[PDB]
Design a protein around this ligand. Sequence first.
Ligand SMILES: *[C@@H]1O[C@H](CO)[C@@H](O[C@@H]2O[C@H](CO)[C@@H](O)[C@H](O)[C@H]2NC(C)=O)[C@H](O)[C@H]1NC(C)=O
Ligand SMILES: [Ca+2]
Ligand SMILES: [Ca+2]
Ligand SMILES: [Ca+2]
Lengths: 4, 302, 290, 70
Amino acid sequence: AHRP
Amino acid sequence: VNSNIPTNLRVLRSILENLRSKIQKLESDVSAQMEYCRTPCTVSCNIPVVSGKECEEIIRKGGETSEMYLIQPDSSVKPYRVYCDMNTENGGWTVIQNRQDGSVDFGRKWDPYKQGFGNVATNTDGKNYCGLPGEYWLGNDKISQLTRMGPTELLIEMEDWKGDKVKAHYGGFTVQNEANKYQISVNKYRGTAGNALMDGASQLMGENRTMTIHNGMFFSTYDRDNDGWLTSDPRKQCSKEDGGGWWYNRCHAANPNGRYYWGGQYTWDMAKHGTDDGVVWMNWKGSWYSMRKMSMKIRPFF
Amino acid sequence: HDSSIRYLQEIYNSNNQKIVNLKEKVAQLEAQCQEPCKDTVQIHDITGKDCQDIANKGAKQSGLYFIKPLKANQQFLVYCEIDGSGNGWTVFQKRLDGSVDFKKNWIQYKEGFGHLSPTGTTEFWLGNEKIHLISTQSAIPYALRVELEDWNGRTSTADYAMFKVGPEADKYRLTYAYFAGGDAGDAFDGFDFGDDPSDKFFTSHNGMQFSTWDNDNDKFEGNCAEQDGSGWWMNKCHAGHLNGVYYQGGTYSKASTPNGYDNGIIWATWKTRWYSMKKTTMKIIPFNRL
Amino acid sequence: VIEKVQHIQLLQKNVRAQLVDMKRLEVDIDIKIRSCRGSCSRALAREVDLKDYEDQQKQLEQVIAKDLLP
Ligand SMILES: *[C@@H]1O[C@H](CO)[C@@H](O[C@@H]2O[C@H](CO)[C@@H](O)[C@H](O)[C@H]2NC(C)=O)[C@H](O)[C@H]1NC(C)=O
Ligand SMILES: [Ca+2]
Ligand SMILES: [Ca+2]
Ligand SMILES: [Ca+2]
């Protein structure tokens, strides 16, 4: 997914 | 009475004994399979007479059945094997990537993703030709050259472990050469799966979404960092985690080439690095759902 | 009681080291499983104008190669049948198990259909166009050898010299100078079926064009290629039909088809009109050979 | 006296950790073996007792709520  | 509880934390021996009996099986399985592999799998794909620049030309020349065909999109490139789909939407589709079972490891370095890997096709038993496609990733070089012969459309299909299929069509698709890190680019979206490649995952607001856009992203393999997640920590790389070779961008909204999680549903406490690796298309089935079937095919668009 | 933390502490430790080793062995497993399934069919590197060109270049084992007639747009795969004497035969038709459906159309008979095996164990049709460019190259006579075999193991061949297939414009017209002989008999010269004193004339094949159910060019009222369900140089209709239906056992009759057609892999000058060959093979080679 | 709860509460976090590292391995191994299906003669037909592992995580996660006598 995305990466904080 | 502080010795009625430590006595109770005996369930620690119980567990610890289970995890030593498991390691037992796992050790035996790995040895069994290791033997099984002393002997390889074989195919005899007798080549079809008809041929062309790609599959669009072959369906036009009479190649009506979907199976392995030989193509030569150029009088300077050694004709190579490939699987053509002559049934899905008027046929003529040149399969670029395919997932259907868990027969092939997609976690490979930069070179294998360059050259291609996996099985193009296997025999339909009783038949002397390979009418069944295998799992593969036709090299990056071959996919690049193929998209740079003229306009090219891309069809991405997938199915869950229940039967539902959804599409994702991109009327425009190109892939630069290796010097440009096989940079991808697409446009003209249709389908019913969600324009992940272009608009990132539809389920995360703000910067979180934009950072999951593949369009315009370079290509990366765990041994070659070209993602859009800047960090000097060698362990923090979209390909290392997530497990595939793909146009990652910190990281993804789509992840074909991911790990083939049998059954469909899977969770963070199952993933190697705890990320959502696995055949994933977020805009459709979440982040913790690995597709049973997922493919990528192309056509000239003419 | 302080005995507890003695076992466990170690059962979790050693069995925890078991793992370090397990992950190590599993990484060696993942190595083997990288190779793809080994494919049997392979293609040789030697290429040429045709199978003879290849043979005269060093080739030695019958198999699949690419050939490019000086007048072809793109090279293409063929099955070169080579012997222990330098002869380079290039096959363009094959039948041996009814595996392939020969009821194809103009484009399919034009471009070619079927499968090419490195061991001549597959049925196919190279393609009229490909056949044309090979037979009508840069001035050099080609010979055609038809090889038959019944359902008993007996073979017979029929040779034709100055073999050539026309361009699409003339409908890949078939032509040869003369029958060169063979225990198969010259069926391309028509056959006295007796069902009419003119059978001979109406069943001859030299000089006919190619026909397909969606492209009738024969000398019959209706469509020969549509009645038989094939593609061939039909007249009205045939004496030698190697692209008919593949009948098992070889025997069949009027009761095989709802119209009593004598379709099927026939060649009258050797077997009756109702015996379908088991194996069949048409190949060509420069006349200035054998 | 209480010099024996830490040992347990060390072992406590140590096991859960191994129970986890294990569930992951179990799976990583199922995936790896299946990826031999298209490389070898055959692939070992196996099943993964996910059930059991979860059954044990819940159970251990339980015991981690003990006391010390605060
Ligand atoms: C994008 O990601 C952030 C992550 O910070 C999401 O909201 C935060 O997520 C953290 C987990 O790191 C949770 O504690 C909270 O739900 C949120 N806390 C913060 C950072 O305010 C959210 O989905 C998105 N927010 C942004 C930064 O755009
Ligand atoms: Ca690997
Ligand atoms: Ca990076
Ligand atoms: Ca007619």
